[PDB]
Design an enzyme around this catalytic site. Sequence first.
Site, PDB file in Angstrom:
ATOM      1  N   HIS A 150      24.118  36.089  44.764  1.00  0.00           N
ATOM      2  CA  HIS A 150      24.647  37.289  44.125  1.00  0.00           C
ATOM      3  C   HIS A 150      24.350  37.345  42.628  1.00  0.00           C
ATOM      4  O   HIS A 150      24.444  38.427  42.033  1.00  0.00           O
ATOM      5  CB  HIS A 150      26.159  37.397  44.352  1.00  0.00           C
ATOM      6  CG  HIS A 150      26.541  37.625  45.783  1.00  0.00           C
ATOM      7  ND1 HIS A 150      27.150  38.784  46.218  1.00  0.00           N
ATOM      8  CD2 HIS A 150      26.433  36.828  46.873  1.00  0.00           C
ATOM      9  CE1 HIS A 150      27.377  38.700  47.518  1.00  0.00           C
ATOM     10  NE2 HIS A 150      26.968  37.516  47.934  1.00  0.00           N
ATOM     11  N   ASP A 354      23.079  39.710  34.320  1.00  0.00           N
ATOM     12  CA  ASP A 354      23.929  40.038  35.458  1.00  0.00           C
ATOM     13  C   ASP A 354      23.067  40.162  36.716  1.00  0.00           C
ATOM     14  O   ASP A 354      21.993  40.780  36.680  1.00  0.00           O
ATOM     15  CB  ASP A 354      24.726  41.335  35.216  1.00  0.00           C
ATOM     16  CG  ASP A 354      26.228  41.148  35.437  1.00  0.00           C
ATOM     17  OD1 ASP A 354      26.570  40.186  36.159  1.00  0.00           O
ATOM     18  OD2 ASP A 354      27.065  41.967  34.940  1.00  0.00           O
TER      19      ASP A 354
HETATM   20  O1  LIG Z   1      40.284  44.883  37.122  1.00  0.00           O
HETATM   21  C1  LIG Z   1      39.272  44.898  37.851  1.00  0.00           C
HETATM   22  C2  LIG Z   1      37.967  44.395  37.501  1.00  0.00           C
HETATM   23  C3  LIG Z   1      36.953  44.476  38.389  1.00  0.00           C
HETATM   24  N1  LIG Z   1      37.119  45.020  39.642  1.00  0.00           N
HETATM   25  C4  LIG Z   1      36.000  45.095  40.611  1.00  0.00           C
HETATM   26  O2  LIG Z   1      35.306  43.865  40.601  1.00  0.00           O
HETATM   27  C5  LIG Z   1      33.899  44.091  40.850  1.00  0.00           C
HETATM   28  C6  LIG Z   1      33.094  43.520  39.709  1.00  0.00           C
HETATM   29  O3  LIG Z   1      31.755  43.293  40.190  1.00  0.00           O
HETATM   30  P1  LIG Z   1      30.512  43.350  39.222  1.00  0.00           P
HETATM   31  O4  LIG Z   1      29.201  43.311  40.010  1.00  0.00           O
HETATM   32  O5  LIG Z   1      30.714  44.510  38.326  1.00  0.00           O
HETATM   33  O6  LIG Z   1      30.580  41.983  38.384  1.00  0.00           O
HETATM   34  P2  LIG Z   1      31.064  40.529  38.796  1.00  0.00           P
HETATM   35  O7  LIG Z   1      32.565  40.563  38.502  1.00  0.00           O
HETATM   36  O8  LIG Z   1      30.831  40.234  40.240  1.00  0.00           O
HETATM   37  O9  LIG Z   1      30.242  39.634  37.872  1.00  0.00           O
HETATM   38  C7  LIG Z   1      33.737  45.600  41.047  1.00  0.00           C
HETATM   39  O10 LIG Z   1      33.734  45.956  42.425  1.00  0.00           O
HETATM   40  C8  LIG Z   1      34.955  46.168  40.317  1.00  0.00           C
HETATM   41  O11 LIG Z   1      35.317  47.405  40.913  1.00  0.00           O
HETATM   42  C9  LIG Z   1      38.349  45.516  40.053  1.00  0.00           C
HETATM   43  O12 LIG Z   1      38.532  46.006  41.156  1.00  0.00           O
HETATM   44  N2  LIG Z   1      39.360  45.426  39.124  1.00  0.00           N
END
Ligand SMILES: O=c1ccn([C@@H]2O[C@H](COP(=O)(O)OP(=O)(O)O)[C@@H](O)[C@H]2O)c(=O)[nH]1
Lengths: 458, 447, 454, 468
Positions: A150, A354
Site C-alpha cells: 500500500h 505517499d
Molecule cells: O480522522 C480521520 C482521518 C483519516 N480518515 C480516513 O483514513 C484514510 C486515510 O488514507 P490515506 O490514503 O489518505 O492515507 P494513509 O492514512 O493510509 O497514509 C482515508 O480513507 C480517510 O478518509 C478518517 O476516516 N478519519
Amino acid sequence: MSRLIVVSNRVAPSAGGLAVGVMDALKQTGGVWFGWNGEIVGTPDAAPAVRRDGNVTYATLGLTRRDYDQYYRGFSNATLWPVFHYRSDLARFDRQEYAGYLRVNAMLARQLAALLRPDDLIWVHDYHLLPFAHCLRELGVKNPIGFFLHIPFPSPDMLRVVPPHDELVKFMCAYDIAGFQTDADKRAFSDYIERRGIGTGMLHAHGRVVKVAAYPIGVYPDAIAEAAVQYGGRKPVKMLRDALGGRKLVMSVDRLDYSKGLVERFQSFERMLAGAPDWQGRVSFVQIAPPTRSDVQTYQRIRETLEREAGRINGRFAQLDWTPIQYLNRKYERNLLMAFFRMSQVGYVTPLRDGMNLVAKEYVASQDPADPGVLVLSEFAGAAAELGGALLVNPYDHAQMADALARALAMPLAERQARHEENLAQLRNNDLSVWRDTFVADLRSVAAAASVTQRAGR
Amino acid sequence: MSRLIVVSNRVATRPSAGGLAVGVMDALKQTGGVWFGWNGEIVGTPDAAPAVRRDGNVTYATLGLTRRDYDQYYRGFSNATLWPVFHYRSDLARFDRQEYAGYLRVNAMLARQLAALLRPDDLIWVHDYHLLPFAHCLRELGVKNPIGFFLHIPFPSPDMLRVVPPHDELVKFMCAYDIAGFQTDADKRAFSDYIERRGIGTMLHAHGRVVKVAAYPIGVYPDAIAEAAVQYGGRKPVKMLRDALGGRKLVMSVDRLDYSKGLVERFQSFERMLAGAPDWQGRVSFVQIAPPTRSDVQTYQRIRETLEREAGRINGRFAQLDWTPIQYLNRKYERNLLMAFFRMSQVGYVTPLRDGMNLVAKEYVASQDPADPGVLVLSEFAGAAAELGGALLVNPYDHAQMADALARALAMPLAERQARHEENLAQLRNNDLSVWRDTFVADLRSV
Amino acid sequence: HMSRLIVVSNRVAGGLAVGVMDALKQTGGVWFGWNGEIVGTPDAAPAVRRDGNVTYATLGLTRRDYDQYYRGFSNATLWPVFHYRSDLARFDRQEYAGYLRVNAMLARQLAALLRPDDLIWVHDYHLLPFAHCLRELGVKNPIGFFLHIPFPSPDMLRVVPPHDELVKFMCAYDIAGFQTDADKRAFSDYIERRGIGTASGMLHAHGRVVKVAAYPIGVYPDAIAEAAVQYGGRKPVKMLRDALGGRKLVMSVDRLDYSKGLVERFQSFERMLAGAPDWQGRVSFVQIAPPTRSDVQTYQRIRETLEREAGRINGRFAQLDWTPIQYLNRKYERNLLMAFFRMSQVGYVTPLRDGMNLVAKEYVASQDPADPGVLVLSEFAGAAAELGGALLVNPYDHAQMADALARALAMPLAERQARHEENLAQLRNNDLSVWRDTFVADLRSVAAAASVTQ
Amino acid sequence: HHHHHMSRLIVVSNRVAAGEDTRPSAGGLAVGVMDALKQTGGVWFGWNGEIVGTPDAAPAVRRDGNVTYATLGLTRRDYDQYYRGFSNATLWPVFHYRSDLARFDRQEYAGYLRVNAMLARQLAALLRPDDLIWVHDYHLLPFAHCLRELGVKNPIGFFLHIPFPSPDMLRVVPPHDELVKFMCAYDIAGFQTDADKRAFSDYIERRGIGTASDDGMLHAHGRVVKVAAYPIGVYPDAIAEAAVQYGGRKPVKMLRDALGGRKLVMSVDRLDYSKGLVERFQSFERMLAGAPDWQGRVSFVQIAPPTRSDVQTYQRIRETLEREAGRINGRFAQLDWTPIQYLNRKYERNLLMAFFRMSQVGYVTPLRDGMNLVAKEYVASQDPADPGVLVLSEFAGAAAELGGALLVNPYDHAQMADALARALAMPLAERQARHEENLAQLRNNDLSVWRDTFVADLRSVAAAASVT
Ligand SMILES: O=c1ccn([C@@H]2O[C@H](COP(=O)(O)OP(=O)(O)O)[C@@H](O)[C@H]2O)c(=O)[nH]1
Ligand SMILES: O=c1ccn([C@@H]2O[C@H](COP(=O)(O)OP(=O)(O)O)[C@@H](O)[C@H]2O)c(=O)[nH]1
Ligand SMILES: O=c1ccn([C@@H]2O[C@H](COP(=O)(O)OP(=O)(O)O)[C@@H](O)[C@H]2O)c(=O)[nH]1
Ligand SMILES: O=c1ccn([C@@H]2O[C@H](COP(=O)(O)OP(=O)(O)O)[C@@H](O)[C@H]2O)c(=O)[nH]1
Ligand SMILES: [Mg+2]
Ligand SMILES: [Mg+2]
C-alpha cells in the site's frame, strides 16, 4: 468457489480502510480474513480466535510485548516505513527487531497454514508482511499467494538503506504476484532485480516466476458524494459553517505522520498570507490531524515541530475574531469528513511521499459538480499519477505551494468544473472495484503447480 | 595544441596538498592552459575584470564575489539545496527562489567574464555542482567551444533529484555540455534515467543537443602517497601519536565535519564494539580528525553539536584514567602527516552515508606497508566502494555490522590483510589520477 | 524659588511620561536620555528642545554605545538575576566595563546642563552607576534612584559577580527607591549582614547616608475606567465581542518575557479545561503577547516553547468553532486594552517575578463596578502586596491556578463586587500621584536638609 | 540488668547503609553516626533502596553486633511520588536556588506526606520512651510531625545536609508554610551553616509565625525549637593515611604514568546541576584559550558518576556537559593530550584520596552546596611538604571555613580561569600557609564535633526546655 484468504496486520462500509476494499471478495467466496487483532497478550496464543460473520470467517491472533516492539514498532515502523518514504535520516535498524519481524511472520504463517485448504487463494497486504509468502512456501504451501504494497516502493539507491534489503527482495519473489500502487513503484522493484543481476511484465528471479504489476487503489466516488450530502446538516457541519461565516475554507485530513508534509504545508499557508495580505481574515485553513504511532520517537518530534509552527503562525497572523490555522487532533467520523470536503473551497494534500493517498481522491469525490472545490496535490503522492485536474505542487517549494493556494481560492467556476470533471472521470474509470476485481482475477489465473514455469497465467 | 581552460569554484598550489590542482595542473602545464574562478575573497562591489596572474606556464584568472553573491550562490542554493539532495538528505534541503536566482545570476556573471578571455579552440573543463548552469550561460553568449562537466559528488536518482524544485531546468542546463562526466556508472545512469524515463531524450539526444555521458572515477598516486607516508613517518606529530598509543591498536578517520560522512553512526559503532568486546577497552584507540566545514550553515552547526555530545557521552562511558577511547580533534593536519598516520594505523574507518568517491579511502590504502598493511572498513555508499573490493564493506545504518567489521579488521591475520591490500593497491595503480585527467582531456579533444 | 526636576531615563518621549510629567511641568524641569536614533559618530552635545515649560535633552547613541547599554550587562546579567533566573545570567567583563563607560558618558553629558540646585531623579537598572558617575564629576545635587524591577535577596544578588561594586554605586544616591518593602529590605539585608553599613530608615554605608524606601507605582484608576468606556465601541472591541458569542473571556496582556510565567499560565488553563470538561467551548483565553528583545537567544527560547504549548493545547481541545487559547503577537493601543479588560470576566496575571505589574492594576481599574471581573494574580508580582481582593496564586502550582480560574469564572456577583471594591480602594489610595508627589517631596527634603546643620 | 544504661540513638534517613557501605572507608552518613550507634546500642531506620511489588508489612531487622538496622522497601508509586517527585523535583532544586528547575505536583506531594506517615508508623512500633531520634535531610521534613501525631514524646532532632533557602526562594515550594510548620515539630532544627539557620529564622520572624528569644530558641506553632548550626566535617588524619596507603594502587599508577609530568587539576562530583560542571569546564577552556602555554602541560580530570538518572533535569544537565566535553576537547586536544578527561565511572573513596594528593589543584565550584566534603577531603589528602591548592566556590557551605582556599564566583568564568592559573603558579610557601590554615580548621571541627554536639543536644534540649 475457492476461498479467498486475506492476510493483513490488523483485522477489522462507512469506515474505509481495507475492509471496504476486500469485503465483497470475501463474501463472494466465503473466504477468511486472518491476522493480528491489535491486542497485546502476556503469553503467545496457542491457536487463532475464529469468529464467523455469515459467509466471512475472521481468524485473529494476539501479539506479545516483545512481538509488538520488534515486529510492528521496530522493523516495520522504524526501518521499513521511513525508508520506503525516502527518509533515510529517520531510519533505525536493529538486528533483534528484524529477527523479531521474521519470527512473527513465521508464527503467523504457521498458524494460517493450519487453516488452509489446497485451493485457497492467498492475498497478503503491506509492508508488515513482506516475508509471509516465503514463510508459507517453507511450510509447503503451494497455493497462489499475491502481495499488495500500500505504500511506495523505493528505488534501489534508497532501498539499500534497509540492511537486509537483499533478503527482503528474495522473500518478495515467493509471491506469485507482487502488486504495487503505481508504475513507478513496480519499476523500482524491477530495477532492483534487473540492475543487481538478480533476475531478468513477468520477472524471473530467485528460481521463481513473479508477476509484477500496478493496481492503484481507488474509491467509490458516487457513494462518497451521497454520504457527503447525507451528513451536510449534522451538528459538526453547522458548527464549522457558522464559524466560517463566509470565509473560504482550506481543508486537510492527515494522520500526524512525517510522510504528510504538515510543516511544509503550514509554512506555505503562512507564506501565502504574507504575500497576499488581502487574504488575511478571508480564508481559514482547517487541519484535522489525529495522532498516530505516538510510541515511535520520530513521530513525537514531528508532532512537536508542527505544534510550534501552529502557535507561531497563528500568533503572527491571528485577529481577535480569526484563527488562521485551526489545528485539531480529534478524529472525526469518515462521513462527516466528506461533508467537510464538500463545504470547502480547497483541498490541501501535500505529502512528501505517499503510496496513493485516498484523502485526495475522497476530496474530489465529495464535491458538488455545480460548485466544486479545487484539489492542490503534492506530486509525490501516488494519486498525482491520476488526478490531472489537481494543481500539482512540489512541497519543497513553499512559494509554489502558496501560489497554488491563491490560484485555487480565486479560480473561476468554469475551470473548477473542468478540472473537477477530469478528476471525477478518473475516479469512475478506476473505482475500488477495479483494484479488487483485477487483483482477484490475477490470483485466479495462477495455477498451484510444482513447476515454477507452469504457475504463471496469461 | 589547444589550451585547456579549467573552471572551478575555488582557484588554488604545491603537489604535497591534494585538491583539484594535483588533478589538473599537469594538463594545464602541458597545454599552456588557464585556471579561472573565484579567489576566495569577498568584495563590497563586483569586480570589473578578473585578476590575472601567470606562474610560469599556467595562467590564473581570479575574481571576487559580493556578500549577496556568497549568500545565494555558495551558501544558498549550492550548499542548502544541491548538496543535501545530491547526498540523499531531503530533510536538510531548503529551497529558496531568490537564492536560486542568485545562483543563476552568479553563474552568468562568471560566464560573461570568462567569454571575454576565451579563444575559439579552447577546451573548457567545468567542475562540480556550483557550476551546473555554466555551459548554458556560455552557449547563450555564442560559445561554440567544447565544454565538459565533471560532477565530484553523487548524482541522485530521479525520485531524489525531484526534491530540487528547478530540477528540470538544471538537467536542461547540464545538456549544454558536450560531456557530462560523473564519478561512477550509478551516477551516470541516474542522469540517463531522468532523461529517458521522463521522455526528455533518447550518447544522449536531448534538448536539441547531443551529450556524451560517462564515468571518470577519480583516483590517487598510490606510489607517491606511499613514499610520503614513509618520508614523514618521523615528524613530531607522528612520534606524539606513536608514543601515546604505546602498543594500542590505532583506528584512523579523517573527515570534514559534514553530515554526509556518518560521523555519529561511526562513533556509536565503535562504542557498540567496545560494549560487545570488553577486552578491547584500553587496547585500541580511535582517532577522528574532523576539521570544521561550512560553519555558517545552521545544518552544519547541528551535526557538529550532535557529534560533540556523542564524543563526550562515549568517552565518559568507557574512558579510563590513561585511555581516551575516541580522540576527537577539530584540527587540520598537513596531508603528508595524514599519510604517516594512515600507515601507522591498523584500521582505516571511512563510513560516509553518501559520498561521490571519497579519496581518504583510497589514500588510506596507498599509505600502508605491504609487509604489514592496515585494513579498510568502507561504507558501500562511498563511490570508492565500486573499486576497492579488498575493503570490508559495511552498511552504516547497521551499527552491529560496523562494529563486527571493526573487530574483524582489528584481528585480521597478516596473510588475509596482505591479500586485501594487494587487491586494492592494484586497482589504485590501474585507475590512478593520471587516468582521470588524460581520459577527460582526450574525450574533450574529440569534441 | 522652585528647583528644576531632572528626570534621567532610557528613552525620552501610559509609561514613564504619565508618572513624571506633572512634576516636570511644575518645576520647569528637564527629561534627559536617549532619543531613539542611532548615530554613525558620537554626538558632541545633547539636542535640546523646549516644549513650553519642559525641556527635552536627548542624545543619540553609536552602535557600540547602544550595544553595551541595552544588549549587554543590563539585559544579560542584571535582568535575569533580578528576576531569580540564575540560569539565564551571562556575565561578561567587557560588557560590564561597557555598562560603566556608557553611564559615565551619559553622566558627563548631563552634568554640563545642570544647575547647582537641580533635583535629579534616575530611573531603573540600566542606570545603577549613574549617581556614582555624577559624584565623580563633582555633582553635589540631590540624586534619587527608583528601581522598577525586583531587587533580589543577597543570595540571588551575588550571582552578579560585581554585586559589591554595584551596591556601592547605589549608595551614591541620596535616595534608593524600590517598588515594595521586600525589595528595600533585600537591599538593607545585603548592606547590614555583610558588614558594609548600619541602619539608623537611613543607611550609613560607603561613607554616605542613603534614604532607603518603597514607592509602589500606581495608576489613575478613574481615568482608566473612563477610557475603557470611551473605547468600548471601537471595531476591535466589537470584533472580540461578536466572536465570543456568549463565551466567557479570560484576558492576559504581557511582553513575551520569561518573567511573565506564560508557559505555566497556558498549562494551567489546559489543566482547568481537562478537569472541568463543561468549560470546553464556553470560555476563551486571549493572550496578547507582543514580542520583546527578539534578538536575544534567551527570549527566543521561551517564545518557541510558548508557541509549541499554544499549538499543543489548541490541538488537544479545539472544536471546529472554538480556539481555546487565542494567542496574538500584535500590540494594541492601550485604550483598546482597557476596553478588552472591561469586557472580560477574568484577568490572568501570573509572573514568576515582577517588580509591580501594572497590567494587574489596569485590569481592576477597567472594570464596571456593577459587573466586575476577577483578577487572578501571582503572589510573586509586587502588586500582590496591595491587591488583596485578587485571587492570589503560586504559579508553580498549576492545580491552584486552574482552581482559581474556575473559581473566578463562577464567582457570584456579590463576592466579585466585594473583591473589586477592595482592589479599587487600594488603587485610589495609592494612585500614580502618590508615587510622584512622595518621591519629589523626599528629593526636596534632601535639599532642605543640606540648608541646615544636622 | 532489666535496665538499659544509655538512651538509644535512633538514626532515621532515606537510605540505610548495608554491606560494604558500613565500612568507615566508604563515607556517607554511616561514618558520621556509627560511633554513637555503637555507643548507645542504637537503631538505624529507613528505606533499603529497594522497590517492592506490594507494601512491606513490617521492617526487616538485622543486627550487626550492637547496632540494629531496621529497613523497609517502597512501592513504585511511593518511590515516584516521595523520592523522584517531591524530594528530587521540588525540594532539591528550590533549596539550591534553582526556581527555574522546580516542578510541583499535588499528587507527588501527597505521596511524600503519605510515605513519611507510613515510615513514622513503622518506626513508632519500635521506639522506647527515652530513645533519641535523629532524622536526616530533606526527604524527611514531615517526619517529626507524623511521629507527634502518633503520640511520640521523645527528643527528635533534624539535620538538613543541603542549604535552607531564604524566604523569597523557599516560597517557590507551594507547601512552604506547612513544611515550616512541620519542622517546628522537632525539638532541634539543625543546619549546615549560620546562613542556613538564619534563612529558617527569617521565614518565621518576617512572616509573623513566631519569635526568637532565650538565646537561639524559636517559639512558633505552639512549640519551642532549638535552631542551630552543626557544619559537617571529616577525619583529616584518617583521610591522609588512606591517601598514602592507596598511593600505589593500579588506577593511581595509571594516572601518574599517563600524566607524565603534566600538572593535574582534579574534580570529583556527582553529576548534579548543583555542582556547576558546565561553568567549570568552560572556565578551564577559558584558561587554556587565555594561556596557551598551558596547553599540553596540564590535564583536567573530572570524575562524575551519574546520579538520579530517572529525573529529567538530571538527564538534560548530563547531555549539556557531554556536549561541552566533546567541544572543548575537539578544540584543544593534541595527538597525545586530552584536555578534559571526563569519566562517569565510580571509584573507591580511598582511591579518590590518592588522586587528590597527586594533583596540584582541587577544583570544587558548585553553584550551590550545603557543605561539600570533597573540598575538605581534598585538603586532607595533601602532602604538607608539597600541598595542592583548593579552588572553591563561595556558594559551598565549606567556603565559610576553608580560609586558605582560593574563593571564586562560578558565574564569573574569567575569575575562575585566573584562579586556576594562579593555583598552578603558586609558590610552595604560600601553598603551605594556605594548606595549614585549612588543615587546622579541619582538625578543630572534625566529624566528631558534629556527632558529639548533635547527640549532646539530643540528650539535653528537650529536657532542659521542660524546666519552668
Ligand atoms: O480522522 C480521520 C482521518 C483519516 N480518515 C480516513 O483514513 C484514510 C486515510 O488514507 P490515506 O490514503 O489518505 O492515507 P494513509 O492514512 O493510509 O497514509 C482515508 O480513507 C480517510 O478518509 C478518517 O476516516 N478519519
Ligand atoms: O586535515 C585534512 C583533511 C582532509 N584532507 C584531504 O582532503 C581530502 C578529502 O577528500 P575526500 O574525497 O575524502 O572527501 P571530501 O572532503 O572531498 O568530501 C583528502 O585528499 C584528504 O587527504 C587533508 O589533506 N587534511
Ligand atoms: O500591547 C501592549 C502591552 C502592554 N501595554 C502596557 O504596558 C504596561 C505593561 O507594564 P507592566 O508593568 O505590566 O510589565 P512590564 O512590561 O513593564 O514588565 C501596561 O501599562 C500595559 O497597559 C500596552 O499599552 N500595550
Ligand atoms: O565517585 C565518588 C563520588 C563521591 N564520593 C564521596 O561522596 C561524598 C560527596 O559528598 P559531598 O558533600 O562532596 O557532596 P554530595 O554528593 O553529598 O552532594 C564525599 O565523601 C566523596 O568522597 C565517593 O566516594 N565517590
Ligand atoms: Mg469585566
Ligand atoms: Mg597534591
